[PDB]
Amino acid sequence: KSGTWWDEHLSEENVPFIKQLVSDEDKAQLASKLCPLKDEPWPIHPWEPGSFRVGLIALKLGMMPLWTKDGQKHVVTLLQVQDCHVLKYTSKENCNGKMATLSVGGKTVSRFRKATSILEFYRELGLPPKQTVKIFNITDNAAIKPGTPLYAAHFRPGQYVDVTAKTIGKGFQGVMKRWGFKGQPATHGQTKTHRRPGAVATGDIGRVWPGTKMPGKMGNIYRTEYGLKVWRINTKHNIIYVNGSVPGHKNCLVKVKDSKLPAYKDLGKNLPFPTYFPDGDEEELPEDLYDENVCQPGAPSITFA
């Protein structure tokens, strides 16, 4: 009848033992999935036109300036992919939709703060619980066996991706901050009217139209940015350098996938399909994958023609 937490009845000699025990198990579980191509992988099919592959979940680290051989400066958001895995696969018929779906998670968190149903679901999967889970629409040939890890090498430089995340919340806000209303003049007789919405509707209808711009909560909603290209990829730290800014605050989880813009369709011909497998790769990728236009930090200073 009383609530409880994991370390409520633990003595002083037991708390460190439990903390390291779960930590060791979590690391062991994560390291056991480092060879997906040897643990009976699902069949791999060649890329075909009209095929959609799975995406990624990353953490927003920050931004740095980036220059090109042309001489222009572009800002890039640091998206780091950590502990990203495929959880479960749902076929097209089961998911009663036009395309099959795939479940992906990332950013493993403590097991002591998860529901019983979620904990047992991860127990059979043999992976630590993830913070967020996203669903990606894929085709039949793009199926990936559950438990397969994913890395930032799944994308390549010169590829346009889409990022979706919850925006920075701002709480209850007025019309000026929320909808950019012009407000009222601050002087010349104005009485208690400097940020008021003013008229909300016409008098004849005798009501307020639904969807009217009114003061209320702002942010903490899911927004997606389209047409963002990848300038650089760091193989060692699994970091993607997406162009421009992305929604969400620092250290927030952002779902990444291939761009849906019509002008960017049929561009996954050379991209890894269904994903990149470092264990089964014949060669080792370089430390950093740059763009053709990106000037390397170690390259000599650019002299224009």
Binding site: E12, N14, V15, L21, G171
Partner: protein
Amino acid sequence: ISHGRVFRRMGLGPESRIHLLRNLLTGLVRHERIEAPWARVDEMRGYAEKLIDYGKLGDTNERAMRMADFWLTEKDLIPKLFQVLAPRYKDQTGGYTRMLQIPNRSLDRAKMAVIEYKGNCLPPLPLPRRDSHLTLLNQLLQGLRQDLRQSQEA
């Protein structure tokens, strides 16, 4: 919008906020244990923590003397800080104070708290203690620890 704002708006303003914290700190120095509203105790805790760090610098350091002069309204406490508190915590690098929650005061049902310097001469507070190692849950986990310990060494 208050993101990253690590200072509470208390008192009549920034000047009053410092003065209120200073008075609480002075009483904490003199009496070694005071009770105050929970929010004010938490805010003052950081200033109390840093006082010993300035006290450890030595009285001959002119920066610490000026800081102690401002933050101690009663001048008799400055010799105490530089010759009692600082020598007591010379081996301790942090956590000089412990803060606990006490039942709300009857005047206005405000959230009350008590903050005191460790190693005081006052009678000990009824500090909350974790479960004993002899209980059923602890014994079962202890047995798991031993069996796991014997498994890895063999």
